């Protein structure tokens, strides 16, 4: 019975390591995912900036068109 | 025994988990806002096209 | 040392592993969402550019109509 118990202990001690390895894999994959995420967020940020520039341009052009229509109206 | 290391690492993981949950709910907000912006942009370009046609008519009539 | 301590440490380790797995899933989900939203932003950019063009031409015609 004693031998059995020692075998069990060695088994658990053997397992916990493997668990730590799996942890390593998971945190590595996580880090990669995080990097991809940050890159995508940067790109999309730039896209949003361009969109804002567009909105400003449209706003200004509509100011001018409004001016021309008010000039034609009076 | 490495009780301190394990508890500390565990606490770190818990913290990062909270931060990430918060961040995911935030990016979901972002998804909603982006959908709304998509629809608004579609309507915007449509109205812009219509105004282009109308303005073309005005030019053809008064120039 | 005794089997109880080894087993408790093992249990705490498995707990940590589960937590880390949750974190992993959250990062993957995050990246996924951000990507899809990236597609949405692409469409938005597209429509905005079209709007800019249309408005530009329209204001040109109004410019010439007032002359």
């Amino acid at each position: 019975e004693l031998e059995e118990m020692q075998r069990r202990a060695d088994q658990l001690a053997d397992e916990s390591l493997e668990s730590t390895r799996r942890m390593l894999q998971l945190v590595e994959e996580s880090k990669d995912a995080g990097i991809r995420t940050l890159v995508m967020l940067d790109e999309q940020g730039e896209q949003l900036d361009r969109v804002e520039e567009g909105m400003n341009h449209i706003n200004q052009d509509m100011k001018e068109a409004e001016k021309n229509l008010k000039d034609l109206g009076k | 025994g490495s009780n301190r290391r394990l508890q500390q690492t565990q606490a770190q993981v818990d913290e990062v988990v909270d931060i990430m949950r918060v961040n995911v709910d935030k990016v979901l907000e972002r998804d909603q806002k982006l959908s709304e912006l998509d629809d608004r942009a579609d309507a915007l370009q449509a109205g812009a096209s219509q105004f282009e046609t109308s303005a073309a008519k005005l030019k053809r009539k008064y120039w | 040392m005794a089997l109880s301590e080894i087993e408790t440490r093992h249990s705490e380790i498995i707990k940590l592993e589960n937590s880390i797995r949750e974190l992993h899933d959250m990062f993957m989900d995050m990246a996924m969402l951000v990507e899809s939203q990236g597609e949405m932003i692409d469409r938005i950019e597209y429509n905005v550019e079209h709007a800019v063009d249309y408005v530009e031409r329209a204001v040109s015609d109004t410019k010439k109509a007032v002359k």
């Binding site: 390591l17 949003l48 | 935030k26 | -």
Partner: protein, 64 residues
Amino acid sequence: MARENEMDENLEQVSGIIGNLRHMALDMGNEIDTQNRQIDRIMEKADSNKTRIDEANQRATKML
């Protein structure tokens, strides 16, 4: 105990990586916040310009 040592070596690596992941999560959050503020602003400007275009269109058709 060597295996135990290997296990110990790992756990520490994991800890460091978790530090990096934390910092990354924080930067991620900050940027998402900035972009949400930005998207809000964008939607306000977009609504404004939409209103302007509708008004201008109405006035343009009025003179037709």
